[PDB]
Design a protein around this nucleic acid. Structure first.
Ligand SMILES: [Cl-]
Ligand SMILES: [Cl-]
Ligand SMILES: [Cl-]
Ligand SMILES: [Cl-]
Ligand SMILES: [Co+2]
Ligand SMILES: [Co+2]
Ligand SMILES: [Co+2]
Ligand SMILES: [Co+2]
Ligand SMILES: [Co+2]
Ligand SMILES: [Co+2]
Ligand SMILES: [Co+2]
Ligand SMILES: [Co+2]
Ligand SMILES: [Co+2]
Ligand SMILES: [Co+2]
Ligand SMILES: [Co+2]
Ligand SMILES: [Co+2]
Ligand SMILES: [Co+2]
Ligand SMILES: [Co+2]
Ligand SMILES: [Co+2]
Ligand SMILES: [Co+2]
Ligand SMILES: [Co+2]
Ligand SMILES: [Co+2]
Ligand SMILES: [Co+2]
Ligand SMILES: [Co+2]
Ligand SMILES: [Co+2]
Ligand SMILES: [Co+2]
Ligand SMILES: [Co+2]
Ligand SMILES: [Co+2]
Ligand SMILES: [Co+2]
Ligand SMILES: [Co+2]
Ligand SMILES: [Co+2]
Ligand SMILES: [Co+2]
Ligand SMILES: [Co+2]
Ligand SMILES: [Co+2]
Ligand SMILES: [Co+2]
Ligand SMILES: [Co+2]
Ligand SMILES: [Co+2]
Ligand SMILES: [Co+2]
Ligand SMILES: [Co+2]
Ligand SMILES: [Co+2]
Ligand SMILES: [Co+2]
Ligand SMILES: [Co+2]
Ligand SMILES: [Co+2]
Ligand SMILES: [Co+2]
Lengths: 87, 104, 99, 100, 99, 106, 79, 99
DNA sequence: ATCAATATCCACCTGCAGATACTACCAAAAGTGTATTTGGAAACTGCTCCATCAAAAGGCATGTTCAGCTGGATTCCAGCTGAACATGCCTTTTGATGGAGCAGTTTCCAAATACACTTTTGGTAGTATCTGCAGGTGGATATTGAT
DNA sequence: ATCAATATCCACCTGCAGATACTACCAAAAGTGTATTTGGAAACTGCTCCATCAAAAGGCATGTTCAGCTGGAATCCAGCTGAACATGCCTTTTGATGGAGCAGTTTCCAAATACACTTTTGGTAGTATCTGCAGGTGGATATTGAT
């Protein structure tokens, strides 16, 4: 019965309209065609780094579940402190 | 008679003395330190609730949401610096468009 | 006589719209799948509190927005209005994400 | 009531709420905003307790006194926030000690 | 002469030992050794402080080698983390298995 | 005293000192016996890593004594040591010779 | 004066080590203010360490501690 | 019959000379004066350990040397080879010092 | 190309700042042996919340194309502004010498921790009952782009 | 300049998600008192290193000349934005479901603390020896810039 499907190419779920919206909030008026792939590259590194520390904290606690606190601690230790999710 | 009432404070001196011991900051914690710290903490809360309340009011709202806290902090040079490496979830940015980007 | 806004008018309009709101701008499921993928390459059989994922989204969209501001500011320095890959790279180098 | 007894999760919310009522008697706060506010107080608590911690160490002192908190506040806060916070905290320690 | 002595301890002699193990024909200036003393103190404080935090996040009253090891993983870049983790387990083993 | 805890661990770095400093340092209520060992080993290793490359640096410049210049070259020329010390300044270390290509002659 | 004792040729030497080839005339004055703000920020913090220690002399360690907390850690004076 | 080097030849020569060395590039006394003058506004009748001023100079020149590195990058971004105040200003804004 | 001018290189040198070496003395640090105390791993398990699917819309927003405008990349050019260059002098460095104050030592007490009843309270739990505002609405102002 | 095709505005509607308002019980927190210990302020001192000024040293302020970099202008065109057009298997939302795994609880023992006693040692401090390399030279050779 066990499901488990293969996860791949999910970085392309970060659509061109979604990157355009973030650029707008950041005040950008005009966007070159190469931005979208550059941004996905940049997001992946960001995510890799936080998830890595986040998951390191999880493992230390001997848990299989990644808590909002693991993220918040992980974000904090990279000087990207977040308010709104506890602790 | 709480040490809060005794110092003229809404914030909890008993808790702050406690949290200071629990957190291993030094071997001993003096009696005034938690009093002074609860005062600072209340001072700063009061400062941000003031500005945020106003931001609430400016947008015709009687309930402070995270947008208000964010407008409060980012519009105040000092709270903005103090919280310059912090992110307020659901706060958004300040409306700001660079000059050159406007038409003529 | 069909109607057309000129290049830049909807862009500016969209800036105002998005600077005005606080809603997350990437869709939830796509983002959650990308988190689950990246985390799975680090360690298999992980589960996520729904708010661990929302924390990552909040943090990720805030980092991205701030970076485009810096990026926009590097375009403008170059006397452009079009953000290019090399503006992002300059932002990230001075930021110390590269040097 | 009571399901195997969940260990208690304490916050500053009722105190943030008191202070909210003082400054804006007719204003409310969302739970999300109260969460940001509780994070903020916890944040600043840690930053000052740690400058204090460090200071004590730098000077071979095993005690954190109000004098350690005070310097920590001057290191941590900018301009007007430091000046005003110093006086409110001095105020509270004066008032506290003259009361027995 | 126990007066003007308030003992200032440093890593300088232990750093010098390790120098000879790696480069027996090589010396070191006072300035450079002072820098190396700083390096060890800094790294000690960073690792010690990260473990403190870990132990706290997890409601533990004790810093064990497990806390030091996670602190090293969080703190050191890829390959540096790998070998340092390998060195520390090596020294704990040698120490546990010692009469 | 029989054997030092350092030699029991195979270490040049002081396990007794590191243990003492973890106590005096207010990091936790308690400190397990193994942590000072682990941390001394890690400290020694990174020391060895830096002295190695700065030793190399001294040689390259035809010298037998390590000066801060050599620690600067060692650290900045290594991607990982340079990252670990990304927010650190080595006094009297100077910079790497680097000149942007667009500034080069003709 | 004082800020002006930070001379044009000294600022140019710093630029050179920074890899700079050509230097706008307005740079020297800009470099001075930047340096003023830098020393204001660090010294403020160093002197706050002095006052706490009940001293009249700024120590290397007061400076080193102030630099640490500015996120500008310096090695070589931690005696 | 006289002899002149082209604009840029001696600049390049200095870049090479100064990147090769490590000596402090501001003269000590002007620096000591400015330090004491800035300190005087925070507290009067201060003395300075001599190693306190050396550390401030080390840190200050390291800061300015690296800031000229980012400034030069910002100039080059704008297709120039001359550093200007706007380049220093772009750096500091992106560095989060003006931000 | 020619080739004079000057920067740069290398070898060999030597004097001395600072590095080593060795002896000595001494607090405190560090290990060893011994009762006693307790954090937290281990096993059992309640109960919260995570993964998963069903199944629609509550259909939204996206991907694809095709047009054509206008921002970017190129090219050229004038004049403006910084680079090079030369040396007395006026400021910095370097050495000399009280004396401020930091660092060392010792004294003692205000306030620290320990710790035991006794009191107070914030968190939670659980239903019970308001209200601010999102989201839909019209419908009366505002902006834009073609003339 | 007018204005029509659109986007935008703001205030007044509703239904409901989420917020405030009850009363309950209680474990933990916080107040009070007392019994005992001690951190560090305070007062005193000596010598270390800091500020000051002896003269001895050398980096830089100055102006003038012009090479070449920078901004302005003009051109061209492709890479971008706006908008229509077909349609997700695509996201959101709802809602139920089983059940993994987190977290509460109790037990209990390995390893921590505590402390007393022995011995080892790193830091400090003279006193002596000694050497790596900075900075002097000379002579060769490469680089640069006018031909
Ligand atoms: Cl590009
Ligand atoms: Cl106190
Ligand atoms: Cl351990
Ligand atoms: Cl400018
Ligand atoms: Co203000
Ligand atoms: Co995978
Ligand atoms: Co320390
Ligand atoms: Co004021
Ligand atoms: Co905590
Ligand atoms: Co290896
Ligand atoms: Co010739
Ligand atoms: Co040769
Ligand atoms: Co000799
Ligand atoms: Co000597
Ligand atoms: Co127990
Ligand atoms: Co076309
Ligand atoms: Co145009
Ligand atoms: Co252009
Ligand atoms: Co011309
Ligand atoms: Co000029
Ligand atoms: Co004298
Ligand atoms: Co004298
Ligand atoms: Co005196
Ligand atoms: Co003193
Ligand atoms: Co007395
Ligand atoms: Co109550
Ligand atoms: Co409730
Ligand atoms: Co609405
Ligand atoms: Co309508
Ligand atoms: Co128009
Ligand atoms: Co109206
Ligand atoms: Co509800
Ligand atoms: Co005492
Ligand atoms: Co020309
Ligand atoms: Co140009
Ligand atoms: Co269920
Ligand atoms: Co289970
Ligand atoms: Co568990
Ligand atoms: Co010894
Ligand atoms: Co010799
Ligand atoms: Co020799
Ligand atoms: Co030489
Ligand atoms: Co010659
Ligand atoms: Co010669």
């Amino acid at each position: 019965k066990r499901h488990r499907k293969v996860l791949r190419d999910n970085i392309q779920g970060i659509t061109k309209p979604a990157i355009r919206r973030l650029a707008r909030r950041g005040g950008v008026k005009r966007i070159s065609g190469l931005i979208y792939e550059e941004t996905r590259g940049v997001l992946k590194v960001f995510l890799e780094n936080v998830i890595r520390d986040a998951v390191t904290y999880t493992e230390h606690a001997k848990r299989k579940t990644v808590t909002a606190m693991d993220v918040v601690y992980a974000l904090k230790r990279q000087g990207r402190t977040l308010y709104g999710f506890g602790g | 008679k709480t040490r809060s009432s005794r110092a003229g404070l809404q914030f909890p001196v008993g808790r702050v003395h406690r949290l200071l011991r629990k957190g291993n900051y030094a071997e001993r914690v003096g009696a005034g330190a938690p009093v002074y710290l609860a005062a600072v903490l209340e001072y700063l809360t009061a400062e941000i609730l003031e500005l945020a309340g106003n931001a609430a009011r400016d947008n015709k709202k009687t309930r402070i949401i995270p947008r208000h806290l964010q407008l409060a902090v980012r519009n105040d040079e000092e709270l903005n610096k103090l919280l310059g490496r912090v992110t307020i979830a659901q706060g958004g940015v300040l409306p700001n468009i660079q000059s050159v980007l406007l038409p003529k | 006589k069909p109607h057309r806004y000129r290049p830049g008018t909807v862009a500016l309009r969209e800036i105002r719209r998005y600077q005005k709101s606080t809603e997350l701008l990437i869709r939830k499921l796509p983002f959650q799948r990308l988190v689950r993928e990246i985390a799975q390459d680090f360690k298999t059989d992980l589960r996520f509190q729904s708010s661990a994922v929302m924390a990552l989204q909040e943090a990720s969209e805030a980092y991205l927005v701030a970076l485009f501001e810096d990026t926009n500011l590097c375009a403008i320095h170059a006397k452009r209005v079009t953000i290019m890959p090399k503006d992002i790279q300059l932002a990230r180098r001075i930021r110390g994400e590269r040097a | 009531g009571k399901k195997r007894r969940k260990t208690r999760k304490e916050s500053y919310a009722i105190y943030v709420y008191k202070v909210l009522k003082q400054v804006h008697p007719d204003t409310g706060i969302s739970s999300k905003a109260m969460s940001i506010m509780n994070s903020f107080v916890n944040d600043v608590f840690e930053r000052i307790a740690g400058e204090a911690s460090r200071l004590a160490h730098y000077n071979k002192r095993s005690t954190i006194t109000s004098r350690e908190i005070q310097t920590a506040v001057r290191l941590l806060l900018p301009g007007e926030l430091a000046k005003h916070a110093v006086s409110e905290g001095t105020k509270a320690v004066t008032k506290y000690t003259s009361a027995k």
